[PDB]
Amino acid sequence: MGSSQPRKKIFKPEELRQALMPTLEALYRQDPESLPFRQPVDPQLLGIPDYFDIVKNPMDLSTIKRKLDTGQYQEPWQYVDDVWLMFNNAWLYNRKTSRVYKFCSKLAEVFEQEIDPVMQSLGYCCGRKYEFSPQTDTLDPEPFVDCKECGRKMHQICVLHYDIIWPSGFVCDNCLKKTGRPRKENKFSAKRLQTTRLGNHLEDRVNKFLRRQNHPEAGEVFVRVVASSDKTVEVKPGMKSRFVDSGEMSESFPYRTKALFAFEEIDGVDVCFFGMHVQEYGSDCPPPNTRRVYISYLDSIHFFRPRCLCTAVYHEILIGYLEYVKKLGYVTGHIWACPPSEGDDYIFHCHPPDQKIPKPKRLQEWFKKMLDKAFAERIINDYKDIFKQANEDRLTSAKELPYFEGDFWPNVLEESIKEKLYATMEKHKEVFFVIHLHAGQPPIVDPDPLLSCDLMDGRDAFLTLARDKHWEFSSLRRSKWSTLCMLVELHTQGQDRFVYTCNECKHHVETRWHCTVCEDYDLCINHTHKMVK
Ligand SMILES: CC(=O)N[C@H](CCCCNC(=O)CSCCNC(=O)CCNC(=O)[C@H](O)C(C)(C)COP(=O)(O)OP(=O)(O)OC[C@H]1O[C@@H](n2cnc3c(N)ncnc32)[C@H](O)[C@@H]1OP(=O)(O)O)C(N)=O
Ligand SMILES: [Zn+2]
Ligand SMILES: [Zn+2]
Ligand SMILES: [Zn+2]
Ligand SMILES: [Zn+2]
């Protein structure tokens, strides 16, 4: 097997000895923490015969020092990988409450502290040994790319290189300043996903708000509707035969589902921090579902900058959605407030281990405070829970309460099969909401076109793809990377591909004169703004 790269970077052994030794030096000054590591583990003095069955590749400061002093490391990544193996042997063998498990953890604290800057000034990205979180002995490792002009291996996630965007391979930042070239634009941005009237409304609401209270670190927000499609919820068999042969209510119930996502710019790159999936039941839907919206589910990653404003803008998103559907025809929404189960993630693949998922009362009062802001906001004219809304809007049978896809009531009515029910309504009353947009006739019209995009049809597609491809949202850097790859997924697996149209003639034109500041204004030659060809 024969390989090449004609002007690689190799480090003279005294070079990387001089660069790396201060970091080992640090590890060594940690007394006593470093003491069980200055020499190899001797199971004869410790009385642990099983050790070399558990730890197959021992490593210790003295071995790394000997390797360093005799130039056995040709690239700093081998140095780094050796000391991480030492730490990983420490963590693997000893219980997480061990004394030397703790020692190990502190040594790792300070080796992280020291290795990032030196590795950086040796051209590389960090000095970390990274691994993806497990699924279902093995772990999958983080990916690397090798710079094309210098050969310095770097964490793909760290430097955010994706071949599909820059198909000529990867070249580092320094190898570019060395050639005076600037970086090539990521066209596959959140901003440049298809913009749409709904998403524009939400993003305008929160952008004005975060200007209103402006922390200097907050960045631009982009809301975007990434899929939209006409589905119908089929009525479950028992529940169906007691009311459809009757003819009281319909076989199916037609709605439009929309998946919509929010991105913030953080360190100059989009970081997708919020997602939502709604079912909207139009004016032509047979009752009970007529003119109702329902948020099928919500999800969030807490890396919004600044975490102070986090919740305020989650709320401004939700209430902007209520405002928008209000304005064009719907009259009641519905927020079943159910906490994320198990280790089940709603919309985003792998959540940050330090992001606490609420218990239902936290959840219920969060929804309640968002709703209160909406009431005060002139926007929603009232709201109350499902029980006090089912007996105030007096109701005697089951085909009278909305019947949504994947909702709880459909399934519990279904299993009330062997017949009580009217009373379970207010056991779970504070988790199910009812939301009145109007106080109080012309039909709904959705300006926004359909967006066929299977990855965002429902929620299983995107989670599955992300679990495969390891797009986790567990780190700000992993989130950055997963946002990147998800955006080029949305951009290049456009199940819609466009039949452009000009705007003064409503024609269908191959060559057109786009406008720069209009959101989509083209003109077939055959006007105010600066048009470009
Ligand atoms: C059968 C089946 O599967 N069926 C289902 C059917 C679908 C159900 C449909 N229903 C829904 O869609 C219901 S709404 C969506 C529920 N899902 C989630 O919420 C996902 C995870 N959570 C979040 O994204 C967020 O919490 C969010 C609610 C979006 C906003 O959070 P936040 O940032 O505004 O504040 P915080 O998180 O409440 O907490 C804010 C403070 O609370 C703290 N905190 C939170 N939780 C806890 C806790 N448990 N213990 C202690 N402290 C705790 C936290 O430290 C923090 O502190 P600080 O502000 O000082 O830093 C299926 N289809 O899978
Ligand atoms: Zn790195
Ligand atoms: Zn380079
Ligand atoms: Zn024309
Ligand atoms: Zn224009």
Side-chain angles (χ1 to χ4, degrees), residues 65 174 199-200 202 227 314 332-333 343 365 401 419 421 433 450 452 456 459 479 503 518 525 527:
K65 188 197 190 310
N174 273 7
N200 290 356
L202 315 188
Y314 299 172
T332 77
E365 42 209 54
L401 44 87
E419 217 182 18
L421 273 71
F433 294 33
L450 266 40
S452 175
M456 298 298 170
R459 78 179 195 106
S479 275
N503 294 85
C518 289
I525 174 73
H527 163 58

mmCIF file of all heavy atoms in Angstrom, residues 65 174 199-200 202 227 314 332-333 343 365 401 419 421 433 450 452 456 459 479 503 518 525 527:
data_model
loop_
_atom_site.group_PDB
_atom_site.id
_atom_site.type_symbol
_atom_site.label_atom_id
_atom_site.label_comp_id
_atom_site.label_asym_id
_atom_site.label_seq_id
_atom_site.Cartn_x
_atom_site.Cartn_y
_atom_site.Cartn_z
ATOM 1 N N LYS A 65 7.069 10.090 28.360
ATOM 2 C CA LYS A 65 8.313 10.854 28.454
ATOM 3 C C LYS A 65 9.434 10.174 27.678
ATOM 4 O O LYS A 65 10.177 10.833 26.943
ATOM 5 C CB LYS A 65 8.726 11.050 29.916
ATOM 6 C CG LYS A 65 9.904 11.986 30.102
ATOM 7 C CD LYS A 65 10.553 11.828 31.502
ATOM 8 C CE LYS A 65 11.582 12.920 31.815
ATOM 9 N NZ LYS A 65 12.588 13.107 30.713
ATOM 10 N N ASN A 174 -4.417 28.509 8.157
ATOM 11 C CA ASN A 174 -3.077 29.071 7.988
ATOM 12 C C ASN A 174 -2.530 28.846 6.584
ATOM 13 O O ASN A 174 -1.909 29.750 6.018
ATOM 14 C CB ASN A 174 -2.119 28.495 9.021
ATOM 15 C CG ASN A 174 -2.147 29.274 10.304
ATOM 16 O OD1 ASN A 174 -2.977 30.169 10.471
ATOM 17 N ND2 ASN A 174 -1.248 28.948 11.224
ATOM 18 N N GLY A 199 -42.602 31.773 8.450
ATOM 19 C CA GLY A 199 -41.306 31.799 9.103
ATOM 20 C C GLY A 199 -40.777 33.208 9.206
ATOM 21 O O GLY A 199 -40.142 33.577 10.201
ATOM 22 N N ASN A 200 -41.073 34.026 8.191
ATOM 23 C CA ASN A 200 -40.682 35.428 8.236
ATOM 24 C C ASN A 200 -41.353 36.140 9.395
ATOM 25 O O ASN A 200 -40.704 36.911 10.111
ATOM 26 C CB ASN A 200 -41.017 36.105 6.919
ATOM 27 C CG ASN A 200 -40.134 35.616 5.802
ATOM 28 O OD1 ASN A 200 -39.222 34.816 6.038
ATOM 29 N ND2 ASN A 200 -40.394 36.076 4.580
ATOM 30 N N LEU A 202 -42.434 34.828 12.279
ATOM 31 C CA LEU A 202 -41.824 34.438 13.550
ATOM 32 C C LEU A 202 -40.442 35.080 13.714
ATOM 33 O O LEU A 202 -40.121 35.650 14.775
ATOM 34 C CB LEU A 202 -41.750 32.911 13.665
ATOM 35 C CG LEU A 202 -43.007 32.127 13.258
ATOM 36 C CD1 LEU A 202 -42.906 30.647 13.598
ATOM 37 C CD2 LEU A 202 -44.208 32.711 13.919
ATOM 38 N N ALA A 227 -40.589 22.139 5.818
ATOM 39 C CA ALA A 227 -41.447 21.157 5.180
ATOM 40 C C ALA A 227 -42.874 21.531 5.511
ATOM 41 O O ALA A 227 -43.144 22.146 6.550
ATOM 42 C CB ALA A 227 -41.161 19.723 5.640
ATOM 43 N N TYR A 314 -38.032 31.288 22.811
ATOM 44 C CA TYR A 314 -38.919 30.144 22.578
ATOM 45 C C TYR A 314 -40.373 30.594 22.649
ATOM 46 O O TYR A 314 -41.210 30.226 21.807
ATOM 47 C CB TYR A 314 -38.682 29.020 23.592
ATOM 48 C CG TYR A 314 -37.288 28.395 23.619
ATOM 49 C CD1 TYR A 314 -36.950 27.492 24.624
ATOM 50 C CD2 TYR A 314 -36.316 28.698 22.666
ATOM 51 C CE1 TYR A 314 -35.691 26.900 24.693
ATOM 52 C CE2 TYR A 314 -35.032 28.103 22.729
ATOM 53 C CZ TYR A 314 -34.736 27.207 23.759
ATOM 54 O OH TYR A 314 -33.503 26.591 23.886
ATOM 55 N N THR A 332 -58.977 28.070 17.363
ATOM 56 C CA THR A 332 -58.500 27.451 18.605
ATOM 57 C C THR A 332 -57.252 26.620 18.340
ATOM 58 O O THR A 332 -57.205 25.859 17.369
ATOM 59 C CB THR A 332 -59.577 26.543 19.297
ATOM 60 O OG1 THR A 332 -59.681 25.289 18.610
ATOM 61 C CG2 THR A 332 -60.945 27.215 19.341
ATOM 62 N N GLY A 333 -56.237 26.773 19.197
ATOM 63 C CA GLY A 333 -55.083 25.902 19.217
ATOM 64 C C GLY A 333 -55.078 24.974 20.429
ATOM 65 O O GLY A 333 -55.930 25.046 21.311
ATOM 66 N N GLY A 343 -35.150 7.972 27.353
ATOM 67 C CA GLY A 343 -34.039 8.664 26.737
ATOM 68 C C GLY A 343 -34.444 8.970 25.315
ATOM 69 O O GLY A 343 -33.645 8.875 24.377
ATOM 70 N N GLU A 365 -46.431 24.939 33.665
ATOM 71 C CA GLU A 365 -46.404 26.362 33.992
ATOM 72 C C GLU A 365 -45.543 27.161 33.024
ATOM 73 O O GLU A 365 -45.787 28.356 32.844
ATOM 74 C CB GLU A 365 -45.956 26.616 35.442
ATOM 75 C CG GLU A 365 -44.792 25.785 35.929
ATOM 76 C CD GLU A 365 -44.847 25.546 37.430
ATOM 77 O OE1 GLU A 365 -45.900 25.060 37.901
ATOM 78 O OE2 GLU A 365 -43.862 25.868 38.137
ATOM 79 N N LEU A 401 -64.781 16.155 20.718
ATOM 80 C CA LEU A 401 -63.485 16.720 21.008
ATOM 81 C C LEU A 401 -62.522 16.429 19.873
ATOM 82 O O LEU A 401 -62.528 15.321 19.309
ATOM 83 C CB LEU A 401 -62.909 16.168 22.315
ATOM 84 C CG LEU A 401 -62.975 14.673 22.654
ATOM 85 C CD1 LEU A 401 -61.782 13.901 22.094
ATOM 86 C CD2 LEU A 401 -63.046 14.519 24.153
ATOM 87 N N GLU A 419 -65.991 -1.323 27.058
ATOM 88 C CA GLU A 419 -66.824 -0.699 28.081
ATOM 89 C C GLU A 419 -68.200 -1.359 28.267
ATOM 90 O O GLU A 419 -68.936 -1.066 29.223
ATOM 91 C CB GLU A 419 -66.998 0.776 27.740
ATOM 92 C CG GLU A 419 -67.014 1.736 28.899
ATOM 93 C CD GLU A 419 -67.247 3.153 28.426
ATOM 94 O OE1 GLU A 419 -67.722 3.307 27.287
ATOM 95 O OE2 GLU A 419 -66.960 4.105 29.180
ATOM 96 N N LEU A 421 -64.654 7.565 31.070
ATOM 97 C CA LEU A 421 -63.806 8.379 30.197
ATOM 98 C C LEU A 421 -63.946 9.867 30.505
ATOM 99 O O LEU A 421 -62.946 10.595 30.605
ATOM 100 C CB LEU A 421 -64.155 8.104 28.731
ATOM 101 C CG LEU A 421 -63.420 6.924 28.093
ATOM 102 C CD1 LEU A 421 -63.952 5.614 28.668
ATOM 103 C CD2 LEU A 421 -63.577 6.961 26.599
ATOM 104 N N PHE A 433 -54.136 21.675 26.926
ATOM 105 C CA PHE A 433 -54.637 23.049 26.878
ATOM 106 C C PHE A 433 -55.641 23.242 25.746
ATOM 107 O O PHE A 433 -55.678 22.475 24.774
ATOM 108 C CB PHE A 433 -53.525 24.078 26.644
ATOM 109 C CG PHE A 433 -52.522 24.206 27.754
ATOM 110 C CD1 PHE A 433 -52.141 23.120 28.531
ATOM 111 C CD2 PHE A 433 -51.886 25.419 27.953
ATOM 112 C CE1 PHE A 433 -51.183 23.263 29.521
ATOM 113 C CE2 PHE A 433 -50.935 25.577 28.933
ATOM 114 C CZ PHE A 433 -50.583 24.498 29.725
ATOM 115 N N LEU A 450 -46.505 24.577 -0.606
ATOM 116 C CA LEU A 450 -46.041 23.343 0.007
ATOM 117 C C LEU A 450 -44.538 23.194 -0.159
ATOM 118 O O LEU A 450 -43.943 23.665 -1.133
ATOM 119 C CB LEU A 450 -46.740 22.130 -0.600
ATOM 120 C CG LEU A 450 -47.984 21.637 0.132
ATOM 121 C CD1 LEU A 450 -48.772 22.813 0.584
ATOM 122 C CD2 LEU A 450 -48.841 20.792 -0.797
ATOM 123 N N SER A 452 -42.398 19.906 -0.012
ATOM 124 C CA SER A 452 -42.194 18.475 0.138
ATOM 125 C C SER A 452 -40.752 18.246 0.543
ATOM 126 O O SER A 452 -39.839 18.556 -0.224
ATOM 127 C CB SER A 452 -42.499 17.743 -1.164
ATOM 128 O OG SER A 452 -42.195 16.366 -1.039
ATOM 129 N N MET A 456 -38.120 15.920 6.843
ATOM 130 C CA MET A 456 -38.867 16.695 7.829
ATOM 131 C C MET A 456 -40.348 16.383 7.805
ATOM 132 O O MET A 456 -41.153 17.148 8.353
ATOM 133 C CB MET A 456 -38.624 18.188 7.619
ATOM 134 C CG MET A 456 -37.142 18.515 7.811
ATOM 135 S SD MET A 456 -36.652 18.114 9.506
ATOM 136 C CE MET A 456 -34.863 18.274 9.451
ATOM 137 N N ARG A 459 -41.258 13.321 12.377
ATOM 138 C CA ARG A 459 -40.076 13.529 13.195
ATOM 139 C C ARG A 459 -39.126 12.359 13.193
ATOM 140 O O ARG A 459 -38.002 12.505 13.688
ATOM 141 C CB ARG A 459 -40.463 13.783 14.652
ATOM 142 C CG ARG A 459 -40.822 12.491 15.365
ATOM 143 C CD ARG A 459 -41.179 12.731 16.812
ATOM 144 N NE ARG A 459 -41.186 11.485 17.566
ATOM 145 C CZ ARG A 459 -40.245 11.135 18.438
ATOM 146 N NH1 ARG A 459 -39.215 11.939 18.667
ATOM 147 N NH2 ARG A 459 -40.328 9.978 19.084
ATOM 148 N N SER A 479 -23.148 20.523 17.957
ATOM 149 C CA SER A 479 -24.352 21.177 17.441
ATOM 150 C C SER A 479 -24.035 22.003 16.213
ATOM 151 O O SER A 479 -24.755 21.941 15.208
ATOM 152 C CB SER A 479 -24.971 22.070 18.508
ATOM 153 O OG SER A 479 -25.827 21.308 19.350
ATOM 154 N N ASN A 503 -42.501 37.762 -12.072
ATOM 155 C CA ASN A 503 -43.452 38.332 -11.118
ATOM 156 C C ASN A 503 -44.296 39.476 -11.652
ATOM 157 O O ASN A 503 -45.359 39.752 -11.080
ATOM 158 C CB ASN A 503 -42.707 38.806 -9.866
ATOM 159 C CG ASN A 503 -42.097 37.647 -9.087
ATOM 160 O OD1 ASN A 503 -40.982 37.190 -9.384
ATOM 161 N ND2 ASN A 503 -42.838 37.149 -8.096
ATOM 162 N N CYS A 518 -35.425 42.433 -2.792
ATOM 163 C CA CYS A 518 -36.685 41.703 -2.693
ATOM 164 C C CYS A 518 -36.439 40.272 -2.231
ATOM 165 O O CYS A 518 -35.370 39.698 -2.459
ATOM 166 C CB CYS A 518 -37.406 41.666 -4.032
ATOM 167 S SG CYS A 518 -38.104 43.217 -4.583
ATOM 168 N N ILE A 525 -37.818 39.937 -18.788
ATOM 169 C CA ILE A 525 -37.650 41.156 -19.579
ATOM 170 C C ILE A 525 -38.827 41.405 -20.526
ATOM 171 O O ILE A 525 -39.631 42.320 -20.301
ATOM 172 C CB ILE A 525 -36.310 41.099 -20.345
ATOM 173 C CG1 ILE A 525 -36.151 42.293 -21.315
ATOM 174 C CG2 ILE A 525 -36.088 39.704 -20.992
ATOM 175 C CD1 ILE A 525 -35.868 43.655 -20.639
ATOM 176 N N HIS A 527 -38.792 49.103 -13.628
ATOM 177 C CA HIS A 527 -38.946 48.681 -12.241
ATOM 178 C C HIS A 527 -37.921 49.284 -11.263
ATOM 179 O O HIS A 527 -36.715 49.361 -11.559
ATOM 180 C CB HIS A 527 -38.866 47.161 -12.118
ATOM 181 C CG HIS A 527 -38.606 46.714 -10.716
ATOM 182 N ND1 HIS A 527 -39.448 47.040 -9.674
ATOM 183 C CD2 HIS A 527 -37.570 46.036 -10.166
ATOM 184 C CE1 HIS A 527 -38.954 46.564 -8.546
ATOM 185 N NE2 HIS A 527 -37.819 45.943 -8.819
#
